[PDB]
Design a protein around this ligand. Structure first.
Ligand SMILES: O=c1ccn([C@@H]2O[C@H](COP(=O)(O)OP(=O)(O)OP(=O)(O)O)[C@@H](O)[C@H]2O)c(=O)[nH]1
Ligand SMILES: [Mn+2]
Ligand SMILES: [Mn+2]
Length: 330
């Protein structure tokens, strides 16, 4: 077995959160919000003199893709869900449609909020992010998400071409079996690193979807086949070292005319529509901090390879991964 592999797997067991289809609690919290949307739309549409439109819900985000992590103490669960409203996009304003959902959920938990990309509802210990889409069958065959808030300049308010199930299919399908298992472990490892080392400034933290898209482009399996038994052993430390090095190699110094300097930027295109850079909202200074911490993680992953003492290998990794990374006693 590869050095530190046991402690990586132990760390993975401690940080992993069971996906929607294996997590009753998450299914219930989701369905509660979906139910409240149905009840709430009735009242919103009583004032407009017709039945509320129906919607088809579908699972989104990490809890759909089986890349979910437990939040740190005092953090929140992030339940991502899509609702496809039975509406023609050309007949309605994206913000109008999100307002229906917001007003439907006004008196639910700690309230609700129109965001650029979703309506978020807040509960004690979690938020539900409802991505709101128009019916492709009434919108010319395209699935469009409702983008914009009231404060949006009307250029940032639109029905944008979207492919959440294509993205989810791409993450599911890149690899199979135990290869796909290591891919998913390495995404969870980076998400716990993110939560541990980007807690001072939440807005500077690399988005989950960015780390997931980065793994889609750049993750390579690391495993070894014993030449006698043909018995396959995974090397998560090496897989993470190669993946972190490849992310670092993809940073580009980017001129900023305001500050009259460059910042190192990592561009990560979504592999599906709308093919946007999911890191575009991260500032140059946030990107430089992201790069330095990624370099520090890369250095720790190399240190963990060379150490005489398993204690010293694990301790070097725990400094980047936090309190769930096992450190065997010297
Ligand atoms: O193809 C796309 C485009 C965009 N999105 C948008 O990404 C959001 C999920 O983005 P998150 O950052 O929540 O991603 P995640 O769930 O994979 O990661 P963690 O929370 O575990 O950190 C969804 O709420 C949707 O609006 C997709 O899910 N798919
Ligand atoms: Mn999420
Ligand atoms: Mn979310």
């Amino acid at each position: 077995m590869a050095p530190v592999q046991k402690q990586f797997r132990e760390f993975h067991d401690r940080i992993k959160l069971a996906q929607y289809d294996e997590n009753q609690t998450l299914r219930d919290e989701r369905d509660a919000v979906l139910t409240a949307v149905r009840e709430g739309l009735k009242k919103v549409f009583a004032d407009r003199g017709e039945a509320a439109p129906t919607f088809t819900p579908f699972n989104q985000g990490s809890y759909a893709m089986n890349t979910g992590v437990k939040p740190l103490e005092g953090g929140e669960y992030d339940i991502d869900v899509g609702i496809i409203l039975n509406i023609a996009k050309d007949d309605h304003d994206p913000v109008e449609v999100k307002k229906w959902i917001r007003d439907a959920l006004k008196d639910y938990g700690n309230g609700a909020e129109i965001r650029r990309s979703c309506v978020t509802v807040f509960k004690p210990g979690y938020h539900v992010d409802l991505a709101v889409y128009a019916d492709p069958e009434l919108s010319g065959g395209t699935l469009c998400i409702a983008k914009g808030k009231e404060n949006s300049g009307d250029e940032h308010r639109l029905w944008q071409i979207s492919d959440p199930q294509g993205f989810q299919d791409r993450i599911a399908s890149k690899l199979s079996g135990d290869d796909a298992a290591q891919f998913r472990r390495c995404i969870r490892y980076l998400k716990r690193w993110r939560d541990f080392r980007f807690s001072s400034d939440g807005n500077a933290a690399p988005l989950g979807i960015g780390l997931t898209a980065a793994a889609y482009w750049w993750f390579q399996v690391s495993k070894r086949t014993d030449p006698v038994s043909q018995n396959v052993t995974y090397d998560d430390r090496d897989a993470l070292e190669q993946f972190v090095q490849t992310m670092l190699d993809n940073f580009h110094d980017t001129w900023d005319s305001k500050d009259q300097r460059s910042y190192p930027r990592l561009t990560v295109e979504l592999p599906v529509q709308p093919y946007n850079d999911v890191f575009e909202k991260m500032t140059g200074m946030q990107m430089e901090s992201f790069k330095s911490k990624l370099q520090a993680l890369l250095n720790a992953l190399k240190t963990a390879k060379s150490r005489l003492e398993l204690h010293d290998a694990c301790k070097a990794l725990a400094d980047h991964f936090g309190s769930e990374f096992p450190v065997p006693e010297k």
